[PDB]
């Protein structure tokens, strides 16, 4: 049982010309169904697909909302939602092929909870050129 | 007065808090009160707060209605209406700071007919902590 829903897209949603094979935008969908009224503080963790990097001004950009915090390490992206109630949020941000890689597999993203354990959800997304 | 009426609000409608310096929304509200039965084509031009700029999957959002389309251009927000009539059609979205800019001034909002050229209104706003 996962008390978020959670889903990702791209835009691209398909490799629809060259631009798709070094640039997409990636757009998540979050909100709180679990047994609570809403989440305490809450994580995004969006792992990045192999070779690729997010571009920090549009992380940045996600603080300007119901962000209080993002981070980039590791290839992670980390965004730290106020809030999360039964209204969705959605975030949208835009990554670059940094290195081409073959066979790009699935990342994984996660939703949790900042203080109460076993409050998570997974999800994943591909490169529209996968 | 006019032969539209047009109200805009922001939420929140003041600067209750440091996240209302970085973002707010936008609802305009509008109706056709006029001669004639309705307007024709009529187009909303949301002008943005200096430093400002909008989230645009929410003006996006906007187009499924009497809403035909929506552009986003030369910080503009356009919203395109296949008719406006007696009754009030209300439109909210979301905008963003991205460089703050010393003293805020208010910022005009216009609704027009796509033909008649004595038919438009005008209204201001302002950033909530301008
Ligand atoms: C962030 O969350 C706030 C809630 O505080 C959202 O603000 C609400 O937006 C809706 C829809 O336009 C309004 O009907 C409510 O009145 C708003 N409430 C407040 C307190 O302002 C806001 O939409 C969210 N921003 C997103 C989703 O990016
Ligand atoms: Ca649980």
Do not use: W
Request: glycine share 2%; charged share 20%.
């Amino acid at each position: 049982e996962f008390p978020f829903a959670l889903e990702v897209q791209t835009l691209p949603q398909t490799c629809d010309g060259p631009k798709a094979h070094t640039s997409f935008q990636i757009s998540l969908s979050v909100s709180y169904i679990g047994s609570r009224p809403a989440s305490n503080m809450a994580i995004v963790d969006v792992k990045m697909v192999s070779g690729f990097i997010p571009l920090k001004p549009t992380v940045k950009m996600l603080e300007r909302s119901n962000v209080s915090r993002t981070e980039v390490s590791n290839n992670h992206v980390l965004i730290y939602l106020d809030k999360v109630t039964n209204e969705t949020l959605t975030l949208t941000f835009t990554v670059l092929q940094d290195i081409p890689v073959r066979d790009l597999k699935p990342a994984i993203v996660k939703v949790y909870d900042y203080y109460e354990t076993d409050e998570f959800a997974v999800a994943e997304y591909s490169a529209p050129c996968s």
